[PDB]
Amino acid sequence: KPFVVVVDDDASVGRAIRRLLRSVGIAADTYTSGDEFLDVLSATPSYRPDCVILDVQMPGSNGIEVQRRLAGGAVPVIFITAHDDAGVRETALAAGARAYLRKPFNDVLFIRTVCAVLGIAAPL
Ligand SMILES: [Cl-]
Ligand SMILES: [Cl-]
Ligand SMILES: [Cl-]
């Protein structure tokens, strides 16, 4: 199964996303700490997601080091942010993010975005 990692400082966001992805056959692990995710990557080469969904607003880190570790490699990144982040597009462009979404999101847009980034057909 496709495997997605979410890093968002709100535990409720990771909870909602992992259940929604499970409903369409996509496994997901979620973190509130970018450092926690980075530590797993460094500890075991076998742990590699097919895509990362990254909260650019995480207080005190902004997901900067997660982005830096993945930059240039085979793991595409989708940026997520709050509904009133007027600048998320330029943020995504300069970071080499594959896509971006504002929270809250509807099912069709979220699933189509993730599936397109993963290179798989979307269920809806
Ligand atoms: Cl859960
Ligand atoms: Cl980070
Ligand atoms: Cl990598």
Q: How is the topology of this model organized?
A:
Layout lengths: L2 E5 L3 H13 L3 E5 L2 H10 L7 E5 L8 H7 L6 E6 L5 H8 L3 E5 L3 H12 L6
Parallel strand pairs: 1-2, 1-3, 3-4, 4-5
The chain binds chloride ion (CL) (3 copies).
InterPro entries: Bact_response_regulator (IPR050595), CheY-like_superfamily (IPR011006), Sig_transdc_resp-reg_receiver (IPR001789)
Keywords: Phosphoprotein
Pfam families: Response_reg (PF00072)
Quick description:
Strands 2-1-3-4-5 form a 5-stranded parallel beta sheet, sandwiched between helices.
Tell me what the structure shows.
It is classed as signaling protein. Keywords: regulator, signaling protein. The assembly is monomeric. The protein is of the alpha/beta class. The protein has a single domain (1-124), classed as Response regulator (Rossmann fold). It contains five helices and five strands. It has helices at 11-23, 34-43, 64-70, 88-95, 107-118; strands at 3-7, 27-31, 51-55, 77-82, 99-103. The protein has a five-stranded parallel β-sheet, with helices on both faces. Helix 4 (88-95) links the parallel strand 4 (77-82) and strand 5 (99-103). It is globular and about 35 Å long. One chloride ion is lined by residues 70, 73-75.
